[PDB]
Motif scaffolding. Structure first.
Motif, PDB file in Angstrom:
ATOM      1  N   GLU A 172       0.823  -1.202   0.000  1.00 52.21           N
ATOM      2  CA  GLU A 172       0.000   0.000   0.000  1.00 52.21           C
ATOM      3  C   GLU A 172       0.860   1.256   0.000  1.00 52.21           C
ATOM      4  OE1 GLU A 172      -2.725  -0.336   3.213  1.00 52.21           O
ATOM      5  OE2 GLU A 172      -4.463  -0.736   1.933  1.00 52.21           O
ATOM      6  N   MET A 173       1.917   1.273   0.814  1.00 56.09           N
ATOM      7  CA  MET A 173       2.794   2.437   0.863  1.00 56.09           C
ATOM      8  C   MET A 173       3.511   2.648  -0.464  1.00 56.09           C
ATOM      9  SD  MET A 173       4.961   3.359   4.265  1.00 56.09           S
ATOM     10  CE  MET A 173       4.183   3.665   5.846  1.00 56.09           C
ATOM     11  N   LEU A 174       3.972   1.564  -1.095  1.00 54.76           N
ATOM     12  CA  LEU A 174       4.637   1.692  -2.390  1.00 54.76           C
ATOM     13  C   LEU A 174       3.684   2.241  -3.445  1.00 54.76           C
ATOM     14  CD1 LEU A 174       7.136  -1.088  -3.523  1.00 54.76           C
ATOM     15  CD2 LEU A 174       7.421   1.389  -3.352  1.00 54.76           C
ATOM     16  N   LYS A 175       2.465   1.695  -3.501  1.00 58.10           N
ATOM     17  CA  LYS A 175       1.489   2.172  -4.474  1.00 58.10           C
ATOM     18  C   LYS A 175       1.135   3.631  -4.225  1.00 58.10           C
ATOM     19  CE  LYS A 175      -3.026   2.099  -6.242  1.00 58.10           C
ATOM     20  NZ  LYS A 175      -3.118   1.303  -7.495  1.00 58.10           N
ATOM     21  N   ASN A 176       0.941   4.005  -2.959  1.00 63.27           N
ATOM     22  CA  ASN A 176       0.618   5.388  -2.632  1.00 63.27           C
ATOM     23  C   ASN A 176       1.756   6.325  -3.011  1.00 63.27           C
ATOM     24  OD1 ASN A 176      -1.805   4.473  -1.644  1.00 63.27           O
ATOM     25  ND2 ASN A 176      -1.254   4.683   0.521  1.00 63.27           N
ATOM     26  N   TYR A 177       3.000   5.921  -2.745  1.00 63.35           N
ATOM     27  CA  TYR A 177       4.145   6.760  -3.084  1.00 63.35           C
ATOM     28  C   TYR A 177       4.248   6.969  -4.587  1.00 63.35           C
ATOM     29  CZ  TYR A 177       8.719   8.857  -2.201  1.00 63.35           C
ATOM     30  OH  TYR A 177       9.777   9.728  -2.093  1.00 63.35           O
ATOM     31  N   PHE A 178       4.091   5.893  -5.362  1.00 70.12           N
ATOM     32  CA  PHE A 178       4.178   6.026  -6.813  1.00 70.12           C
ATOM     33  C   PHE A 178       3.024   6.852  -7.369  1.00 70.12           C
ATOM     34  CE2 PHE A 178       7.558   3.653  -8.950  1.00 70.12           C
ATOM     35  CZ  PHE A 178       8.189   3.086  -7.863  1.00 70.12           C
ATOM     36  N   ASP A 179       1.827   6.707  -6.794  1.00 69.43           N
ATOM     37  CA  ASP A 179       0.691   7.508  -7.241  1.00 69.43           C
ATOM     38  C   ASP A 179       0.879   8.981  -6.901  1.00 69.43           C
ATOM     39  OD1 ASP A 179      -0.228   5.051  -7.966  1.00 69.43           O
ATOM     40  OD2 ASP A 179      -2.123   5.169  -6.866  1.00 69.43           O
ATOM     41  N   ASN A 180       1.406   9.274  -5.710  1.00 72.23           N
ATOM     42  CA  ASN A 180       1.540  10.654  -5.267  1.00 72.23           C
ATOM     43  C   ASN A 180       2.695  11.369  -5.952  1.00 72.23           C
ATOM     44  OD1 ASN A 180      -0.636  10.637  -3.335  1.00 72.23           O
ATOM     45  ND2 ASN A 180       0.676   9.419  -1.984  1.00 72.23           N
ATOM     46  N   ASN A 181       3.751  10.644  -6.322  1.00 71.33           N
ATOM     47  CA  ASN A 181       4.839  11.286  -7.051  1.00 71.33           C
ATOM     48  C   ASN A 181       4.487  11.480  -8.521  1.00 71.33           C
ATOM     49  OD1 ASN A 181       7.465  11.803  -5.445  1.00 71.33           O
ATOM     50  ND2 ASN A 181       6.786   9.808  -4.680  1.00 71.33           N
ATOM     51  N   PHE A 182       3.931  10.454  -9.160  1.00 73.36           N
ATOM     52  CA  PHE A 182       3.520  10.535 -10.561  1.00 73.36           C
ATOM     53  C   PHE A 182       2.016  10.797 -10.645  1.00 73.36           C
ATOM     54  CE2 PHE A 182       7.345   7.886 -10.490  1.00 73.36           C
ATOM     55  CZ  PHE A 182       8.138   8.570 -11.387  1.00 73.36           C
ATOM     56  N   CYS A 226       8.764  -5.533  -4.725  1.00 71.98           N
ATOM     57  CA  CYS A 226       8.330  -6.272  -3.544  1.00 71.98           C
ATOM     58  C   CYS A 226       8.844  -7.707  -3.566  1.00 71.98           C
ATOM     59  CB  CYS A 226       6.806  -6.245  -3.440  1.00 71.98           C
ATOM     60  SG  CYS A 226       6.127  -4.625  -3.023  1.00 71.98           S
ATOM     61  N   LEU A 227       8.754  -8.369  -4.723  1.00 76.38           N
ATOM     62  CA  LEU A 227       9.240  -9.741  -4.826  1.00 76.38           C
ATOM     63  C   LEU A 227      10.740  -9.815  -4.574  1.00 76.38           C
ATOM     64  CD1 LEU A 227       7.226 -11.151  -7.867  1.00 76.38           C
ATOM     65  CD2 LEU A 227       7.028 -11.807  -5.465  1.00 76.38           C
ATOM     66  N   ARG A 228      11.500  -8.878  -5.148  1.00 75.15           N
ATOM     67  CA  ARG A 228      12.943  -8.872  -4.952  1.00 75.15           C
ATOM     68  C   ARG A 228      13.302  -8.621  -3.496  1.00 75.15           C
ATOM     69  NH1 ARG A 228      17.446  -8.648  -6.131  1.00 75.15           N
ATOM     70  NH2 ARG A 228      17.059 -10.833  -5.568  1.00 75.15           N
ATOM     71  N   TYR A 229      12.592  -7.707  -2.829  1.00 73.80           N
ATOM     72  CA  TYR A 229      12.884  -7.450  -1.423  1.00 73.80           C
ATOM     73  C   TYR A 229      12.580  -8.667  -0.559  1.00 73.80           C
ATOM     74  CZ  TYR A 229      12.626  -5.532   3.280  1.00 73.80           C
ATOM     75  OH  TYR A 229      12.795  -5.307   4.625  1.00 73.80           O
ATOM     76  N   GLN A 230      11.463  -9.350  -0.826  1.00 70.30           N
ATOM     77  CA  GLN A 230      11.137 -10.546  -0.052  1.00 70.30           C
ATOM     78  C   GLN A 230      12.183 -11.637  -0.258  1.00 70.30           C
ATOM     79  OE1 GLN A 230       7.094 -11.516  -1.147  1.00 70.30           O
ATOM     80  NE2 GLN A 230       6.347  -9.568  -0.321  1.00 70.30           N
ATOM     81  N   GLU A 231      12.577 -11.869  -1.513  1.00 68.95           N
ATOM     82  CA  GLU A 231      13.616 -12.859  -1.778  1.00 68.95           C
ATOM     83  C   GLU A 231      14.928 -12.465  -1.114  1.00 68.95           C
ATOM     84  OE1 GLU A 231      13.986 -13.553  -5.934  1.00 68.95           O
ATOM     85  OE2 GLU A 231      11.944 -14.322  -6.156  1.00 68.95           O
ATOM     86  N   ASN A 232      15.269 -11.176  -1.162  1.00 71.05           N
ATOM     87  CA  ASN A 232      16.523 -10.708  -0.588  1.00 71.05           C
ATOM     88  C   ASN A 232      16.548 -10.892   0.921  1.00 71.05           C
ATOM     89  OD1 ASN A 232      17.999 -10.048  -2.821  1.00 71.05           O
ATOM     90  ND2 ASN A 232      17.670  -7.832  -2.681  1.00 71.05           N
ATOM     91  N   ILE A 233      15.455 -10.554   1.610  1.00 70.96           N
ATOM     92  CA  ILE A 233      15.444 -10.737   3.058  1.00 70.96           C
ATOM     93  C   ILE A 233      15.529 -12.220   3.397  1.00 70.96           C
ATOM     94  CG2 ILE A 233      14.295  -8.551   3.537  1.00 70.96           C
ATOM     95  CD1 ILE A 233      11.682  -9.912   3.750  1.00 70.96           C
TER      96      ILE A 233
END
Length: 145
Positions: free
Chosen positions: A57-67, A87-94
RNA sequence: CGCCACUUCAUGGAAAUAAAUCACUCACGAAUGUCUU
């Protein structure tokens, strides 16, 4: 990147989708402004990624509010695809690197410089992967006419 | 029917409120990848 999970599949699909094919019927209109946005807002994206409960939700909100301009209505697919890949890359990385980082830091033999070389930040690594994918897309797409 | 004037001269409320806060493009291009004794 790790070829184990769906991050590799999403990366390949993003490359296939947003790379221009030769003249022949329409492509998905890659936007180059997101490349510099991710680089400049990398630390904010790290903060967003570290929030476990409201990450998507935070990622989607940030991308919507910037663009948030009229032109960006055509790039919603690109924004959603890069959000999913991040999100997938961050989950795999952690999953791959968290305990490794803790044990490396808890080690006493290793020097600080070697510790920092061995330690990789999951969020920043994922952000760099997205940045490099977008840079490759733009490099393939752009021609100096 | 005659005679005759005085008094009063702004208070209360609203004193800014929302929308847009940068957008798109270019993010290095060309030469040199060894040369002369």
């Amino acid at each position: 990147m790790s070829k184990k999970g769906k991050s590799y599949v999403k990366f390949n699909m993003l490359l296939q989708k947003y790379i221009l094919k030769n003249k022949d019927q329409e492509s998905e209109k890659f936007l180059s402004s997101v490349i510099q946005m991710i680089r400049a807002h990398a630390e904010i994206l790290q903060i967003i990624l570290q929030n476990e409960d409201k990450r998507t939700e935070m990622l989607k909100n940030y991308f919507d509010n910037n663009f948030n301009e009229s032109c960006h209505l055509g790039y919603t697919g690109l924004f959603e695809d890069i959000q999913t890949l991040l999100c997938l890359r961050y989950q795999e990385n952690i999953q791959d690197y968290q305990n490794r980082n803790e044990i490396i830091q808890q080690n006493t033999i290793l020097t600080s410089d070697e510790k920092e070389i061995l330690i990789v930040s999951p969020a920043m690594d994922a952000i760099h992967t997205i940045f490099t994918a977008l840079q490759f897309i733009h490099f393939i797409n752009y021609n100096k006419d």
